[PDB]
Amino acid sequence: MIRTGTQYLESLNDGRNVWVGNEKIDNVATHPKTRDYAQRHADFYDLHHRPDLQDVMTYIDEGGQRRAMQWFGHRDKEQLRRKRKYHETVMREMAGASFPRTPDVNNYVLTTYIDDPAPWETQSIGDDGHIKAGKIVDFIRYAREHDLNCAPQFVDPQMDRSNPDAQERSPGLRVVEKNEKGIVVNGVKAIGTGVAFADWIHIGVFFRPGIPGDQVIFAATPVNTPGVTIVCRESLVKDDKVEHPLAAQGDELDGMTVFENVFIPWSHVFHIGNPNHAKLYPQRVFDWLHYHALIRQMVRAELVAGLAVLITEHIGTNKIPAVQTRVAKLIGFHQAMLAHLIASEELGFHTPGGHYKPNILIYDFGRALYLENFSQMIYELVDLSGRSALIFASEDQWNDDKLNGWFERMNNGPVGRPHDRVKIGRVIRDLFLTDWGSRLVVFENFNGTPLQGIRMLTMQRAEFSGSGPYGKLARQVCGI
Amino acid sequence: MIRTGTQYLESLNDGRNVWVGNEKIDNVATHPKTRDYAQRHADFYDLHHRPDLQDVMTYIDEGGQRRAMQWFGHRDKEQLRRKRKYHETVMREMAGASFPRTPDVNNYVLTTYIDDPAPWETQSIGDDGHIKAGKIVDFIRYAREHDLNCAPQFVDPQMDRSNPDAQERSPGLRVVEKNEKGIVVNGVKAIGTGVAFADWIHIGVFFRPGIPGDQVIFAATPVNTPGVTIVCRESLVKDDKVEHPLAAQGDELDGMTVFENVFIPWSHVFHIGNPNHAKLYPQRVFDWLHYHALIRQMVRAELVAGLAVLITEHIGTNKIPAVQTRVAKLIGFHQAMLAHLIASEELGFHTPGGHYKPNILIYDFGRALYLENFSQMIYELVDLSGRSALIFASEDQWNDDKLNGWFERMNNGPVGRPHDRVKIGRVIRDLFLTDWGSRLVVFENFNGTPLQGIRMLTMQRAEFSGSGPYGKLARQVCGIDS
Amino acid sequence: MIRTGTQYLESLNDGRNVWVGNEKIDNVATHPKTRDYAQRHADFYDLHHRPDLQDVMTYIDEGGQRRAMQWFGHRDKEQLRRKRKYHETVMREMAGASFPRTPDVNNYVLTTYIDDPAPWETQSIGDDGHIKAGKIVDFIRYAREHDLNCAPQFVDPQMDRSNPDAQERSPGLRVVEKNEKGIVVNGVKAIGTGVAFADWIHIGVFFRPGIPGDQVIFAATPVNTPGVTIVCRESLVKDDKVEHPLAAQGDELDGMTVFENVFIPWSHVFHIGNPNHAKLYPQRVFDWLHYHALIRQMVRAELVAGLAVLITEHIGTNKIPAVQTRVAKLIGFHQAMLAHLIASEELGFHTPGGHYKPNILIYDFGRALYLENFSQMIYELVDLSGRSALIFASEDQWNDDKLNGWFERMNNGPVGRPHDRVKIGRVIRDLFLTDWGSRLVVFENFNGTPLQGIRMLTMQRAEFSGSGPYGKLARQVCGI
Amino acid sequence: MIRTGTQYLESLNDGRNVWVGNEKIDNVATHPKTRDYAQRHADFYDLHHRPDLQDVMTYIDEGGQRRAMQWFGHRDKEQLRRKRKYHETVMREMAGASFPRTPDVNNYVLTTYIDDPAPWETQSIGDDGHIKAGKIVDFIRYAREHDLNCAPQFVDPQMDRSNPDAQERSPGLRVVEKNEKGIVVNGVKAIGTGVAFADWIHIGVFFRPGIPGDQVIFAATPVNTPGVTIVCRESLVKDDKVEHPLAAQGDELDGMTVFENVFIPWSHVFHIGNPNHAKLYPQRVFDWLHYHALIRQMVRAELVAGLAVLITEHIGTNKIPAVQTRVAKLIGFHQAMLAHLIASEELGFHTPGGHYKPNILIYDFGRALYLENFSQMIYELVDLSGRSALIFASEDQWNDDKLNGWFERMNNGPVGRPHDRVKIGRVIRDLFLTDWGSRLVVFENFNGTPLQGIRMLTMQRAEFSGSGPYGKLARQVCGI
Ligand SMILES: Cc1cc2c(cc1C)N(C[C@H](O)[C@H](O)[C@H](O)COP(=O)(O)OP(=O)(O)OC[C@H]1O[C@@H](n3cnc4c(N)ncnc43)[C@H](O)[C@@H]1O)c1[nH]c(=O)[nH]c(=O)c1N2
Ligand SMILES: Cc1cc2c(cc1C)N(C[C@H](O)[C@H](O)[C@H](O)COP(=O)(O)OP(=O)(O)OC[C@H]1O[C@@H](n3cnc4c(N)ncnc43)[C@H](O)[C@@H]1O)c1[nH]c(=O)[nH]c(=O)c1N2
Ligand SMILES: O=[N+]([O-])c1ccc(O)cc1
Ligand SMILES: O=[N+]([O-])c1ccc(O)cc1
């Protein structure tokens, strides 16, 4: 049976060691700084039990068990679109894609292991044959069985970008002890999203020139593993849900994980020791976060275009021709994201293990296109609003016997409903003019590497050549 | 048979009255200023007789007749993809999409009439029951039977944009007589591409506020109709095909058409008199040419990105990290044009007559995306080339006993083949640094309306509202009633 | 003598009727939500008593009295640059232009009345000869004598932009009674910055098609005038000045002003009744704010560029060639703002009253250049920082016995000083990733009209003609 | 006496060895592919004899000799503005800066040698003391006395950018012999503008990593020197001055210069042998070109803004609110170019020999801002024009008895003067839609290095650091 939100909230009180800013958290489920986002994860579990949402949110496995669609493997295009429809519905149900690391996103990358588990084993170095491909699949099947949230921590510390030789002093997680039972790791996974809210840490690494084998670690450990400390930025959750209808729903915390001589049994180790394996295989893990990112980009673009339509109608600028072509840019951006999502699904291919994967070039350049344009799209939405994005009644001002009459008249545009402008303003302010909204903009910018990173890695991986089928047309037109 | 290139060249010498700059043209087929682009249209006809392309270029109709795919109707997605592959093959064969108004593009717009002819008739005003839906279909079948090129002239004179009342004085084509046999028209179809190379003129209008009813004319007349004069800009064809391998292939002339009391029989009149009809129906005619524009935008973006890969490889900048992220911009643009074309095909719908149409929002916003970015993408290609885009040996300089050794060494980059940098330069120069090239850029910018018009017209036609689909998620998030 | 901060804070306890969000404010000088920005105005007054700053902050008037430079009139280029060095020093001393409506800015616009007071009187309609030019000059000499902060409220309600016929239903402030003693005004000045912190409201209006005579009001009244209510957005001030060294310094509130049958004596009315007068004259009042905006833009661009130099040096990206050209964008933007400032001062002209005014075209197109670019410049600073702009230790995380050694290694870039990355993070985050910093971005975007309005008003006022000296070069090249 | 156009044309027939595309040129003065641009240089000389221009075009030296202002040294801001007015007048008189390498531009860079000749001598390696500062001054005085055009050729071959080793296989000009009379140079100066039209070649080089001593050459040699071959791109001059009123005026040819064992006496060698000397000193020579570029940029932007004003008035779009804000962008761009020119003049400094040099950062960042925006500004001008930029009557079509009536009515917008739209179209088409105009855009893009190069080279030269006066405001705000 599928986990409930109540079971998830109970499970959070497991002794995990967690800083949120200056404070220690006794219980992530109940602490003021964490309880609203924890309840957003609780809401995610409870969506799967809804009889009205069952056909979208669940599937019947070959054994006849109803399971959550976060565990659904896609082997053709129809099945990919069914998975995409699930992810899309989850983000619409949760404050218009305002919580981008729900468990469905975290656990999606596990499919790279399921698809082709052998290389993780065969390419391992210094494990003395202890790592079994069979044991990776058994862990992922365990996660599925208990609807466990595995939060992915791969990225390096941002220590010193001047040196290629600065991966020896780096506090990056290292294997300090290999024995008969497992590994002992010491150091830091420098960055992760929502680990304080997860069940297990999915530990990984990306290749950087000169990475030592003792820092090449793929594994899983519980969030309450002795020697694990979760260290998070201050919570940006807001007290008043009337003034802050989105930001009061909770803050998806980011931070680092300190490992103090942490023991991981070989059963929960996926791969150690091979920098060459860390070149391509970790990209294949993160490809699924990258495809999902496009589903989010389409939904964010749709929300932004909708808010521009609502605000320009409510202040009455929507028929001004020069405003009409500015709304067109925000609508065209949404259509562009939609087009990349649909085309990447059309031009997909089968992986080694028979999973259907969307076209890498289309979704990854679709991500570059979003990051290139998104700050300008935020500028357009806010600029189109005028003052209505920020200078609007608080609720007790609106309802005051003296002020009400003035506010109703000041907000009386062509689609009447004066208070609706305050509702639009609250959402624009929360999304784009609060620390809470700013974190999400920063998250979109970095989580999948920033623009100059997406372009570089996309070119390195594609290995585009004048002699390859790109330059076919150019060579023919040139007489070459 | 399908018409041949040589039949086309013979057909051109039909007494049509043609200016090309300061010169009159005796025979468009043979005149130095026109014969090259005439030969590109002959090449287009001859692609349909190439045995290795038979399956891409022709189909068998329900009567067992092999015909040019330019006449093929698409009723599902599979059929639309076979028509797109035909258009794409034509532009790839024809100098990397350097000739955007070959007959397959011109004739594509006629499918709107074939799909739903009746409203052209029913909505006409003042024709006294003479216009017949069946006669529109009969003309379009006659064009198909003879593989005739119907060049579309719709757009108004650019006279005075200050006030709609100024259209009182507009020299735009007007009905000046209606009789039992047909109409007489007098004035100008102010702008058209390739009319000097076509068989028939396809006349129409777009609504602009205060367009006079006497200027709402949809019809067809031969290019050599008595009273018609074709008046074209100067030809930009280049003499030396070694130095200009693209611009020596000919210049797709644009210009205006003068109609002096031209008689058109009712049989060749599709619609008169109704400004309301000219709002939605002409946009449905040009939908097919906007979809085709997406195919051209993909192929052109592919060419630019390819040229950027070739020149950065040859001068040896391609592994410099800063240059690599700039080439990724050009490749990403191509991938975005690819995404819009595929997505528009996937999200299409059936027209009232059962034709499958690609998604209007996607191809039109894709066109807007292209016009917004293309100037910057040409800058990038030229800027990535450095001096190699412009400052290179002429062929006699290259082959000189004294200069060859210096040129060979000056062009000796990581992929050897020194003379190849000149081959790449020639193409970059022709496309983006000659009059011939700039005309194509200006064509792409204006032919399907410019960026601000694309945006205006797409919004007006779509009428997106807070209470429609674009408001649903925002209304939910804001807690606003549906 | 020149007002002190202590006198200012004492003067706020005057009965003024003030909302800040859902709360009524007992005393703007002492209330938790207002006291910090009130102390920022007190610091402003105190800067004029600092002996090392006397030459820059004060001048000796013809009477031999020392006065604040906010009262200095400039009749030549040298005098303009001396005024500009004062404004520049104020915003540098006050958190790098983080408080853009200090009294020196508010009061700057009064110079337009001083330069040529008569037309305000003579072009008035319906005042029965009660309005006197000498009284306008007397009010402004009174503000000077007492160092009074006159907050300008001119802009209309954002009610309904669909209609030029909106002006009929406008809750905009209107004259409801005229008698022998003065006018009674009823309705709203819909938007103003810092009015809760000012002494007087400078009332005025901009022309709009069909503006009725009864809404053409230029006047001044105390903030504590009976029937005046100040209604402000919620305060964005932060409690912890270690985590938030800028946002803890106070929030420059924006809001509206309600007038309920408010009496203004004729002596404090500058002009009523003439729509035509409201076309060009209000633009001449606000010219001084537009010139001043170029000084702030320069200082803001210099801060952004410097923050980019500091963070790229500290994370070790400053010598990566592709980062060096990005940093060059931010520096070039600063030089562009400096270039417009200096050029506006060089190409100035004398007004009717003999004041020296900088080049309108250079400073207004300068403001347009700033709003076209600033969003992308912030995107660039944040993007250049990577995670360091958001994910950094709180102070108690930093100093913890366990986490300190990890934090010090993770922040050990090429210029040592690990903790300085947290220092730089905190400023980037206050400025562009908090509620507080976002208000300043929105203020900059709208206070002097947004980009499309700057362009439209500049073109409308300039009346550029093909036949004018503008197009002479084009005419000669064309042979027209 | 100042040189005349006639003396200059006479001097071109001196046996210089010139390719223009596939053709050898008997005489640059009279050949169809060269005579028009040679006549533009003749017009340059003849401008200095127009009695109405003598005050702008000439000055009286200490001796009492009247000379061309191209030889005027500026020792203060007032003298610099006088030199700028000269350069501005030349480019306004000559088809609105369509001919950017007139002799006044070429010869401006000689001022760096005059200001401080000693270092060129003292830093020379391997010349055995034969190079003398006095001879450098003697050559530049000889150029002045005879009004000689010294065309600068510094930039390297663009052979292979992948390799720093690339400097050994380089066909770049190298010293193959040194004797007691002078040097023999063999190789290529790979790029120059207008050398076929010049009197002398001014040879220089810029530093690149691993440049050998034997390629560090600064010298002067006649264009007709035995063993010099000038190899030019094909000429883009147009035949019909009515259809092409700018492109028929001549094509400013670009090309390479071949040296086969060319002898240069020590008397005309400025420096050899020191790669370190080639780091900063060549940048000081080209500074004057970079400042001059800012004058051209202002004139070009003024021409583009004027054409937009002219064409929008003629077609009747000039009052459409949405077009009005587009034209504001082009006018804004001109004002920005004006601001940088003026500010650079205002914020200049004295060189070691006491010449006044304008602010390097402002003029080099001004060039960056121009190259970043120019392509968008061309797009806007062409887009604002509609078909009128390209599709217009030829003169014989216009004057045809049948076609005239139709063309008059088609071009009868709100300011009448139908044929004037053709006059405007012809200039837009020549500048931005011909071979000839595109060469000028390309020239503007590359001649002072392209955008990414300006940014990289300006940052490397400035040595901006967080601890420097740059980062003072940011350090203060951060509490560092
Ligand atoms: C809010 C949030 C949330 C998450 C994460 C980040 C953030 C901000 N991350 C980590 C994230 O992927 C990481 O921040 C980005 O890859 C960017 O890396 P750095 O922050 O180290 O900047 P970095 O120092 O790499 O880059 C900083 C700037 O310099 C530029 N630059 C750096 N080197 C360059 C070069 N050689 N050439 C050109 N330009 C260069 C970059 O392009 C960028 O603009 C993460 N990770 C994870 O594994 N799991 C997670 O759940 C999350 N979640
Ligand atoms: C933070 C802050 C602080 C202040 C102020 C605002 C704000 C936000 N203001 C008022 C400020 O000047 C005002 O917000 C701007 O001029 C914008 O006016 P609206 O808010 O009504 O937008 P408005 O409704 O005018 O504009 C909305 C958007 O639509 C566009 N648009 C509207 N009409 C258009 C048209 N006809 N053509 C094309 N585009 C059009 C605008 O360009 C903009 O993008 C103010 N005022 C004051 O007097 N004293 C003060 O101290 C302050 N302080
Ligand atoms: O100008 N503005 O108001 C803006 C611009 C960008 C942004 O992210 C937020 C607000
Ligand atoms: O090649 N270079 O280093 C150059 C070239 C031209 C210039 O104006 C400055 C520097």
Numbering used by the authors:
A (entry chain B), C (entry chain A), D (entry chain C): 1 to 480
B (entry chain D): 1 to 482
Mind quoting what the paper says about this structure?
HadA is a flavin-dependent monooxygenase catalyzing hydroxylation plus dehalogenation/denitration, which is useful for biodetoxification and biodetection. HadA belongs to the class D two-component flavin-dependent monooxygenases, which use reduced FAD (FADH–) as a substrate. The initial and committing step of the had pathway catalyzed by HadA monooxygenase is hydroxylation with removal of either halide substituents (F, Cl, Br, or I) from HPs or a nitro group (-NO2) from NP. Each protomer is composed of three domains: the N-terminal domain (residues 1–146), the β-sheet domain (residues 147–275), and the C-terminal domain (residues 276–517).
We also solved the structure of the HadAPhe441Val−FADH–−4NP complex at 2.3-Å resolution. Although 4NP can still bind to this variant, the quadruple π-stacking motif was disrupted. The overall structure of the ternary complex of HadAPhe441Val is very similar to that of HadAWT (RMSD of 0.143) without any significant changes in the active site area. In contrast, the signals and amplitude of both A380 and A450 in both HadAPhe441Val and HadAPhe441Leu were independent of 4CP concentrations under the same conditions as HadAWT, indicating that the binding of 4CP does not prevent C4a-hydroperoxy-FAD formation. All data suggest that no substrate inhibition via dead-end complex formation was observed in these HadAPhe441 variants, which are void of the quadruple π-stacking complex at the subunit interface. Of interest, the complexes of HadAPhe441 variants and 4NP (in which 4NP can bind but the quadruple π-stacking is absent) showed increased Tm values (ΔTm) of only around 1.5 to 2.1 °C. Therefore, the Tm results imply that, upon 4NP binding at the subunit interface, especially with the quadruple π-stacking found in the HadAWT, the quaternary structures of HadA are likely more rigid than the apoenzyme forms. The difference between the structures of HadAWT and HadAPhe441Val around the subunit interface areas and Tm values clearly explain how the dead-end complex is stabilized in HadAWT but not HadAPhe441Val. The rates of 4NP conversion by HadAPhe441Val, HadAPhe441Leu, and HadAPhe441Ile were 21 ± 8%, 24 ± 13%, and 17 ± 10% greater than that of HadAWT, respectively (p-value < 0.05) (inset). The data indicate that alteration of Phe441, which removes the quadruple π-stacking interactions and, thus, dead-end complex formation ability, indeed improved biocatalysis by HadA.
